[PDB]
Structures are given as C-alpha cells and as structure tokens.
Design a protein around this ligand. Structure first.
Ligand SMILES: *[C@@H]1O[C@H](CO)[C@@H](O[C@@H]2O[C@H](CO)[C@@H](O)[C@H](O)[C@H]2NC(C)=O)[C@H](O)[C@H]1NC(C)=O
Length: 212
C-alpha cells in the first residue's frame, strides 16, 4: 500500500503548520521509523525529521516530528519563504520494504511579485567550432515560479528546437530557469535577429541579440 497525506496546505509568514501522514499498524502504527523530506524544484530531497521526531544537523529547530496511532505529523513553526516546497513522509515497515506519502504542496503567503530579469546569450565561438548554436536565455529572480517562454527568428516566431528548464528555487527563494533554442551554425549565421520573450503574470520581458 501507500501513506495518505493532504494534497495542499497554505500558511501565513510566522504561523505553525501541520502535515499529517496516515498509515497502518504495519508502518506508522507499530514502528518508530517515519521520516520527512522536502523537495525544492531543482533540488534533491532533504531529510528534516527522521525516526518520528529527530532532526539531523543543519536542519532548523522550527521543524518537529510526532506520531499518534497510525498518524505521523510534521510541524513547521515560524514559517519563512524557504519553507515553500513539496513535503513527503517515508516509513520503514514490518519487513524490509518502505512506504511513501502522496505528498503535500506547502505554500507560504507573504509572496511579493518579482518579474524575471532576462539575459540572452548568443552561442560561444568555442561551441561554434563544435558545430552547434544554442542560444541561452537565463530567466532569473522571479516569483511566483512560473513563466511562458517565446522565441522568434527576428519577427517570424519559432516552435522548433525549443527547450525550457523547470524553475529552480535560488538561495533568495526566487526562481531561476533557462530556455535553450538549439540551432545549426548556418541557421544562426543566417537570421539578422533573435528574441527571447518570457511572459510572467501578464507582464512580458524581451531580450535581443544579433550575429557578428
Ligand atoms: C487522516 O486520518 C485522520 C484520522 O486520524 C482524519 O482526520 C479526521 O478528519 C475529519 C474530517 O476529514 C475531522 O473533522 C477530524 O477532527 C479528524 N480526526 C482526528 C481524530 O484528528 C483525516 O481525514 C485523514 N487525512 C488524510 C489526508 O490522510
């Protein structure tokens, strides 16, 4: 089977928050081995609570663990911006197998808008001899963490060779992403202009670059 947890939980900056993790006598109920992880977009999970209530080193004392019956609970007090993430519970069973929580999208609410700062890179002379032409559009310091990109071969828009990373929570908790328009060196040499245009909560940001 699987561990049941709420889908979404939202909190105001400073408040305490509780994420439950419902299980059975075969996991949460009969064992002291429930652990909590946090997913930040471009990050690998980080253990905040292990064996019900134990915090590892470098994890804030604002995190606490608990269990009653078949229900485990993670308590984040004094909510801050970095706390906005995806939370998951894990438990060791009667056997060697392990069970996983459905996950919980924890949202903080102070959340000031921050339009992205766009930086458009032409392909490097180093990459050019390598027979590739990837234009890199570095979208940074944006909030909330979502954008719609749009490339153009001067004015004529392009939908081919477009790749867009998922936003990754930076150290200041704002998001940063990257869009790649992969072209051939003749393709690049030809067009007199290229444009990168992100759209974020209606407001659009546009950078331009031209070959030399
Ligand atoms: C997890 O199971 C708990 C029981 O421990 C459920 O919590 C109860 O839910 C109802 C309505 O949904 C409330 O009015 C009660 O006060 C809760 N009871 C207790 C004893 O705390 C809960 O619905 C389950 N949820 C998930 C997401 O797994």
């Amino acid at each position: 089977s699987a561990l049941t947890q709420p889908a979404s939980v939202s909190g105001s900056p400073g408040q305490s928050i509780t994420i439950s993790c419902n299980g059975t006598s075969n996991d949460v109920g009969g064992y002291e081995s429930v652990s909590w992880y946090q997913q930040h977009p471009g990050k690998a999970p980080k253990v905040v609570i292990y064996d019900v209530s134990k915090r590892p080193s470098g994890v804030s004392n604002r995190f606490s663990g608990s269990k009653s019956g078949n229900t485990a609970s993670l308590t984040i007090s004094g909510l801050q911006a970095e706390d906005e993430g995806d939370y998951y519970c894990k438990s060791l069973t009667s056997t060697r197998r392990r069970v996983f929580g459905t996950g919980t999208k924890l949202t903080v609410l102070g959340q000031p808008k921050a339009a992205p700062s766009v930086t458009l890179f032409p392909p490097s002379s180093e990459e050019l001899q390598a027979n590739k032409a990837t234009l890199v559009c570095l979208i940074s310091d944006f909030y909330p963490g979502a954008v719609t990109v749009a490339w153009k071969a001067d004015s004529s828009p392009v939908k081919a060779g477009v790749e867009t990373t998922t936003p990754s929570k930076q150290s200041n908790n704002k998001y940063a992403a990257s869009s790649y328009l992969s072209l051939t060196p003749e393709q690049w040499k030809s067009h007199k202009s290229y444009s990168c245009q992100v759209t974020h909560e209606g407001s659009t940001v546009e950078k331009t670059v031209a070959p030399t």
